[PDB]
Amino acid sequence: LAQQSQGKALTLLDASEAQLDGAATLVLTFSIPLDPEQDFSRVVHVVDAASGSVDGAWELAPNLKELRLRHLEPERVLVVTVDPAVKALNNATFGKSYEKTITTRDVQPSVGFASRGSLLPGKIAEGLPVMALNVNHVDVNFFRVKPGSLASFVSQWEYMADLVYTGRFDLNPARNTREKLLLPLSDIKPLQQAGVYVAVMNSNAATLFTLSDIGVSAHRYHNRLDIFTQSLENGAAQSGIEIVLLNDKGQTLAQATSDAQGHVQLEADKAAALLLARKEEQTTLLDLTLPALDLSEFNVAGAPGYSKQFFMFGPRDLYRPGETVILNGLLRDSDGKTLPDQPVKLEVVKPDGQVMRTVVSQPENGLYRLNYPLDINAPTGLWHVRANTGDNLLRSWDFHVEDFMPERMALNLTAQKTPLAPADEVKFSVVGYYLYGAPANGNTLQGQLFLRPLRDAVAALPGFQFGNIAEENLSRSLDEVQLTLDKGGRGEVSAASQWQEAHSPLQVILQASLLESGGRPVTRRVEQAIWPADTLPGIRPQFAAKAVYDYRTDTTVNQPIVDEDSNAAFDIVYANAQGEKKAVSGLQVRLIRERRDYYWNWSESEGWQSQFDQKDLVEGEQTLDLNADETGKVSFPVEWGAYRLEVKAPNETVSSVRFWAGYSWPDRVTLKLDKANYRPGDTMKLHIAAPVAGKGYAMVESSDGPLWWQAIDVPAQGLELTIPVDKTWNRHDLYLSTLVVRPGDKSRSATPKRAVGLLHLPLGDDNRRLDLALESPAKMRPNQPLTVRVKASVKHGEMPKQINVLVSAVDSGVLNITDYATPDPWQAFFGQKRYGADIYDIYGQVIEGQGRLAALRHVNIIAQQAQPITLNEQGEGVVTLPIGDFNGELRVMAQAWTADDFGRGESKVVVAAPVIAELNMPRFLAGGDVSRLVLDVTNLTDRPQTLNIALAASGLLELLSQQPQPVNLAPGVRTTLFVPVRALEGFGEGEIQATISGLNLPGETLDAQHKQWQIGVRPAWPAQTVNSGIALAPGESWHVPEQHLANISPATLQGQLLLSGKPPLNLARYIRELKAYPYGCLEQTTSGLFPALYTNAAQLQSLGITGDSDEKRRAAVDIGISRILQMQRDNGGFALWDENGAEEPWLTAYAMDFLIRAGEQGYSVPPEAINRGNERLLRYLQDPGTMLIRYSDNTQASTFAAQAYAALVLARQQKAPLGTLREIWERRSQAASGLPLMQLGIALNTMGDARRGEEAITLALNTPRQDERQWIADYGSSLRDNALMLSLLEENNLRPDAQNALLSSLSEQAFGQRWLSTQENNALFLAAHSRQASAGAWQVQTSLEAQPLSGDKALTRNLDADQLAALEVTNTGSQPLWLRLDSSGYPSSAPEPASNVLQIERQILGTDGQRKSLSSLRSGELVLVWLTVVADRNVPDALVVDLLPAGLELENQNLASGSEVQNLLNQMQQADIQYMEFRDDRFVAAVVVNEGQPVTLVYLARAVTPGTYQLAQPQVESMYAPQWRATGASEGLLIVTP
């Protein structure tokens, strides 16, 4: 506002010092608010009359009248000056200069102990740190805690004593400066006597310290506690008693006395806070609630060591909404051996924490499997699969759900294929274009160049590596790329060579992103190979790469490794890019050993670091001569460690390959072992070395507790121990700990008294890994089975027995998104588990460690998993993987297991097509639309191609042009064909099939290329329906009313004829209308799900309905249940459109009702949802104030309805407090309908009080629904209420003579036709379902068949246009006949706009805000669609629908460059939008319409595919009073030009 300050000058009210936030602050207060823009420095300033300037940090309050300056040095003369300016907000300005002198006064005294104290003991323990400010002295009283009330006293602390005062310490700090001082206690004689003391002053006035000799160490486990008491003074070893206490409570949990070794063991979980160790008059305390010792610098990282190991894994961790998540599981013990068969409880968890599915997973041949179909609208984010094996230690397998947006543009980057000399510069050709056929003009290209080594430089020679792996400056970042492109699509990138010295093959990589408007770029990458010689050497090891762990990545990586002290063989070649193998003589072949000498190194910024110096030694040398077409084979003997084989040729070009001979590739206690890896029967030699000699103990332990331990005295020369390995040692979480302590409490040279050592105990085995060899071709073609041969090996011994293998194949990109590593079970079962104990200590706390190190370096996703196979006796097998289309790289993966052994295999397969064909088309089509499809064909072969393209249109789609002429494509060239098509009348899909003949390839015969695209086809106009019926007396005749035929086109005209000998109900119509409903709000989904629950296909076909093979139905119910769960709130309540939406109790009752019903029919629903739902219903019943019904007209009625429904739903479950039901029954007069009374009545009758139930029923049967149709939030009507009441009657076998009359009434009342709500349909379905109409005889003569139709049950029959156009019916029975005719089809003429209650209008603007014709639109043009809705009433259930023309596509943007446009937008920001959706063919929006308040909706849309498109009328209706409809005038057609 601030206008209220107008007319007022600017006077300074007060400049003074004041306390603010505990600090001395200079505050100026002016009369009126100032200019908040910080200009304070040249106008207002403070200057010390002695020290000059000071901090000028001028602060400004939330209030604008006060100017602040914080933190002023006390007792100083400040001169404050305000200059004539400051302006203020109303530019009133400060007249002239103002000067004021100030003295800043003194600060108030303060004293206190720096810390509340510690529990660390000392033999004398002097020095008490205190923070004193402006105080000359302090009096201190010293108490000694009574050994009796000691426990409770200390427990009062952290979560009753005598007095030994001395007091009066002389503290002389500088004036006005807080100083840190020490209170010495050495010269005090009545204090060095051991005990627990407390100092008190006269803000932390108290502190605690302890004098003692008992040094205490402790190792805690998840349910065990081991204590070691030794000497602080004379080395170590000590007896004495100790006890465990509670938090706050001084209650003793457990007690024990030290043995002759110092060791003690006590059973204790958490909630055991204070540890107390006593020996007569001596005492030492240890707080187990404080943080434990930091072991971040020790190699103690790894997975938890569970008793039962459950290895979960799959082909990937990145899925999209819609597709199915595949999960596999294997269960073993602590040493990877089989356990007795057992179930595992698996739960699916979506990002918000809510459970989506709960399955009791049973194994199948020892393999757990799970398939979770993600809903098409599933939330994006981090999902978990949560496994429970029985220990209630939840295992978690994370996986990502993400949705990817299309590209809508195309970028083409190409290079020169064949390698370049270092001198040459590198040229990349760029070609960008819009998908709809337009060239990308003036589009800015943003990329970057990179240089990398090229080791796989010859495709004709796989495995052979090239280049010196030790050559420097082969991996660096080159130039950035900014290219305006300019031309109609094309551009060029050029890279000058900074590489010359290179003796290895290189590749220069261009990675570039194409931009349309700085919104959603299209990125691509391309590489150019570079050789330092037309010919050069290549190396391929004869030995296979073995699988080994890599802690830097925590993934089991493949590495070239050979046995220690052995022979390494290699295949050498001398070759060129194309072809293979040339002649040469004098290849210099060296075996280089890479020696590394490690050493520790300390710094301030780093702490301690493990450094290492490297030296390359020549340990072998051969000389080789090669002929034409020869694979020279060399062999070098190796020993241990890292080697690399180097081959050099006379042209100074080098090629190197690194490998290993061993599978192994200061302020602490150094622990060393004689050998790496043991067995559970061997014996290990432990070398212990400490910086300073001392005493303590060594330990071998795990989780749960310790297995072995021995106290030790370590001299300053090291100490050697011998430890046996029991048979019970096989957990892989085994750690060897060591504690050493220096004798003296007081010592020079600093010296840390306590020192710790910690090492992982190797205990794995080298004969339990399945070595997997996956054999498959490096290249293949799409749409042909992928053959993968599995060959297993085990190094030592025989090829196990019955090796199970699970092979999979996934697009490498998807895997590369998440950096997904191929799962290995070996590392899962045998890998290094974490140190599962916490070390509490009394000696000085750890430094900080600084921390552990780290390492450093729409389309249908192809992702399959074959069934598990079993290898033969030789460990051989084969799997076939059907590959669909796809063009790129596949990572083939395999996990193998037996009962005891496990393994993992990787492989890579490049799927490439000789020619690629991409068909760009619109997102959908409407019947009659004419559209220009774009078919891009590109030849990827090395040869020129003459191709014959054959196109065919299937389904609701036809071609308009003649077949294409043959095309001549040069290698790498792309041609573009235009395919004009038209869509046919119908609701379905259209298919386009493309066939390419010719192609000519040497080496292959290759069948012709086939492709097929689908597109969705719907009618341009809403489906029209006509409903009529009549009663026929005997002899009476009837003919189809002309209304069923008028102005709607045949071949779209369906009919259903229902004949019955009793007042019928259109069951088929309800079912069909439910199944056809296209929107997925809660109530609609539920309502539509109800029929699929209680009706099988056998019952469906009787009503003239077919489809869904029942199992499909079950699947559909499951899907629906998921869709219901996806909208349950955190409180167990439900929402209408989304989980974050407002809560609606009635719907909660509804959805719950369906979920219980679904449970009853044998479907699976997670108990969390059921329970939270029931809790929410119970809270609806017991705490009605938690409710908040919106947009209601009678909150009482709403509340009552909700409570009644919830009452019934819980009553069905026998979970409804009767007292509450009665408490509600007393509020019956608030009921605005009979339905809640009925529901409540049933609940009462169910939970006991049958009387008040029957009363409630009888009352319901005489309580007409009453409301000026405002809302009530029950989603109801007279009709649906009557239906549901009849349903409740029929379901519980109550009043017959009433339900008969009401059934007839409902049959006749069901003529509120043409438009029913989903709720009404569901209600009517339930009423018709639970009905039993018994025997009702009828005979009839028709035009459908020569013979007469006859029956005793209501018969429904389908009719086509011909049967319906000429339908005649005549009753030939002895009794009356009820006849219903339901007709549906689409109009041959555009229907007239119509309105009722609601009004809808659509206008079309441009971005300039001016009206725009839908006939002059060019491709890529933007337009604003302006909808306006209005009504003379409050419609809280207004659903707006705007069918699109196929020429337009939506921009997904809510809230929506300037001007009058913004005047619309803002209005749209005033509308209360309950939901909004941007489909492929619709703009949908749920809104509430307020009386006399126009609702304004604007949305953005782009024109793309050129063509002539049908254009429908805007539509709006009330979802639950759908007689309130409006359609609003359309121009009829849309024209899009290129």
Q: How far is CA 1006 from CA 65, 191, 886, 912, 1349, in A?
A: 85, 99, 17, 13, 59
Closest Cα to residue 1125, out of 1164, 1179, 1073? 1164
Helix axes 1167-1182, 1218-1225, angle to 10 degrees: 40
Contact 1052, 987 (CB under 8 A): no
Helices (H), 484-589: none
- Rounded CA separation 755/697 (Å): 11
CA distance 1126 to 1149: 16
With 0-12 / 13-18 / 19 or more C-beta atoms within 10 angstroms meaning exposed / middle / buried, residue 1264 is exposed
For residue 63 the two structure tokens come to 């209030």
Contact 968, 945 (CB under 8 A): yes
CB-based burial of residue 11 (10 Å sphere; 0-12 exposed, 13-18 middle, 19+ buried)?
A: exposed
Is the separation of the CB atoms in 285 and 277 below 8 Å? yes
Q: Which two tokens stand for residue 257?
A: 């006395």
The three-class DSSP label of residue 1203 is helix
Residue 851 tokens read as 């921390």
Sign of CA dihedral 999, 1000, 1001, 1005: positive
Name the DSSP letter for residue 145.
B
Q: What is the DSSP string of 75-142?
A: S-EEEEEE-S---TTTT----S-EEEEEE--PPPPB--BSSSEEEEEESS----EEEEBS-SEE--EE
Decide: 704 and 718 in contact? Cβ < 8 Å.
no
Q: Yes or no: say if 1352 and 1338 are a contact pair by the CB < 8 Å rule.
A: yes
Tokens of 9: 């000058």
- The answer to whether 1403 and 1499 have CB atoms below 8 angstroms apart is no
Strand-pair category, 694-701 with 706-714:
antiparallel
Q: What angle in degrees, to the nearest 10, is found between the helix axes of 1067-1076 and 1082-1094?
A: 130
Q: Are strands 1507-1510 and 930-939 parallel, antiparallel or unpaired?
A: antiparallel
| 1472 contacts 1419 by C-beta, under 8 angstroms | no
Strands (E), 1005-1149: 1009-1018, 1024-1032, 1037-1039, 1048-1060
Mark 1192-1221 as b/e (b = at least 16 C-beta within 10 Å): bbbeebbbbbbbbbbbbbbbbeeebebebb
- Compute φ and ψ for 177, nearest 5 degrees: -140, 120
Sequence-separated (6 or more) residues with CB below 8 Å from residue 1043 = 1026, 1028
CA distances from 1269 to 1194, 1274, 1363, 1434, 1436 (A): 11, 12, 41, 9, 11
Rounding to the nearest 10 degrees, give the CA dihedral for residues 1432, 1435, 1439, 1445. 10
Q: Which two tokens stand for residue 1167?
A: 């108990």
Q: Which of 1277, 1245, 1251 is nearest to 1264 (CA)?
A: 1277
Q: Which long-range contacts (CB under 8 A, 24 or more apart) does 1209-1213 make?
A: 1209/1149, 1209/1152, 1209/1153, 1209/1156, 1209/1177, 1210/1174, 1210/1177, 1210/1178, 1210/1181, 1210/1243, 1211/1242, 1211/1243, 1211/1244, 1211/1246, 1211/1247, 1212/1153, 1212/1156, 1212/1246, 1213/1156, 1213/1174
CA torsion 327-331-336-340 (nearest 10°) is -160
**Residues 661/641, Cβ–Cβ less than 8 Å:** yes
Contacts of 591 (CB under 8 A, 6+ apart): 618, 619, 620, 621, 636, 638, 643, 645, 646
Residues 6+ apart with CB under 8 A from 605: none
Continuous segment of H or E residues that includes residue 1186: none
Distance between CA atoms of residues 1418 and 269, nearest Å: 74
Residue with tokens 């008040």, as numbered in its chain: 1252
Element (H, E) at 186: none
Judge contact between 535 and 582, C-beta under 8 A: yes
What are the DSSP calls for 787-852, one per residue? Answer: EEEEEEE-SSS---SS-EEEEEEEEHHHHHHTTPPPP-HHHHHHS-B----EEEESS---------
The angle formed by the CA atoms of residues 626, 630 and 636, to the nearest 5 degrees, is 70
Q: What is the three-class DSSP state of 550?
A: strand
882-900 burial string, b = 16+ CB within 10 Å, else e? ebeebeeebbbbbbbbbeb
Q: For residue 18, what are the β-bridge partners?
A: 25
**What tokens were used for 261?**
């070794």
Helices (H), 1134-1277: 1145-1160, 1167-1182, 1195-1212, 1218-1225, 1234-1247, 1250-1260
CA–CA gap between residue 550 and residue 556 (Å, rounded) = 6
Instruction: Give the three-class secondary structure for 600.
Output: strand
What does the block give as tokens for 1028?
């009529």
User: Helix or strand or coil: residue 344?
Assistant: strand
| Tokens matching residue 1420 | 């890529």
Report how this structure was experimentally obtained. X-ray
CB crowding 32-70: b at 16 or more within 10 Å, else e: bbbeeeeebeeebbbeeeeeeebeeebeeeeebbbbbbe
Buried b / exposed e over 395-430, threshold 16 CB at 10 Å, is bebebbbeeeeebbbbbbbebeeebbebeeebebeb
Question: 245-249: which pairs have CB atoms within 8 A and are 24 or more residues apart?
Answer: 245/151, 245/155, 245/272, 245/273, 245/274, 245/275, 245/276, 246/155, 246/271, 246/272, 246/273, 246/274, 247/155, 247/159, 247/271, 247/273, 247/274, 247/289, 248/155, 248/156, 248/159, 248/273, 249/155
Helix (H, G, I), strand (E, B) or coil at 62: coil
In Å, how far are 356, 516, 597, 763, 1142 from 379, measured between CA atoms?
A: 11, 29, 53, 44, 18
Radius of gyration for the chain, computed over Cα atoms and rounded to the nearest angstrom: 42
Angle at Cα 1032 formed by Cα 1031 and Cα 1034, nearest 5°?
145
Q: 98 — phi, psi (to 5°)?
A: -135, 130
Distance (Å, whole) CA 936 – CA 312: 43
Going from the C-alpha of 290 to that of each of 151, 158, 207, 301, 1092, the distances in angstroms are 18, 10, 18, 22, 59
Q: Which residues pair with 951 in a beta bridge?
A: 994
What's CA 624's distance to the chain center, in Å?
57
End-to-end CA distance of the chain: 52
Q: How far apart are CA 290 and CA 270, in angstroms?
A: 12
Q: How far apart are CA 1240 and CA 1249, in angstroms?
A: 11
CA distance 678 to 520: 57
Going by their DSSP bridges, the two strands 902-911 and 769-775 should be labelled as parallel
Q: Position 1373: which residue type?
A: G
CA distance 1257 to 1291: 14
Cα separation, 1272 vs 1280, in Å, equals 14
User: Which residue in the block uniquely carries the two structure tokens 């100074």?
Assistant: 652
* Residues 268, 274, 277: CA angle, nearest 5 degrees: 95
Q: Which amino acid is at 29?
A: T
CA 1503 vs CA 263, 349, 384, 1420, 1445: distances in Å: 82, 40, 41, 5, 10
**Summary count for the chain: helices (H), strands (E):** 18, 93
d(CA 911, CA 888): 5
Q: For residues 1247 and 1253, what is the distance between their CA atoms, to the nearest angstrom?
A: 10
Q: Long-range contacts: 1192-1197, Cβ < 8 Å, 24+? A: 1192/1270, 1192/1271, 1192/1272, 1192/1273, 1193/1267, 1193/1268, 1193/1270, 1193/1271, 1193/1272, 1193/1434, 1194/1232, 1194/1267, 1194/1270, 1194/1272, 1196/1230, 1196/1232, 1197/1230, 1197/1231, 1197/1232, 1197/1233, 1197/1267, 1197/1272, 1197/1274
CB of 1235 closer than 8 Å to CB of 1262: no
One-letter amino acid of 268: A
Name residue 548's beta-bridge partners.
557
CA dist., res. 740 & res. 240, Å (int): 20
Q: Distance between CA 969 and CA 988 in Å, rounded? A: 36
Report the candidate in 752, 781, 985 with the shortest Cα–Cα distance to residue 846: 752
Q: What six digits make up the tokens of 378?
A: 């599933």
Parallel/antiparallel/unpaired status of strands 318-319 and 395-401: parallel
- Closest by alpha carbon to 258, among 227, 219, 217, 223? 227
The span from the CA of 278 to the CA of 216, in Å, is 10
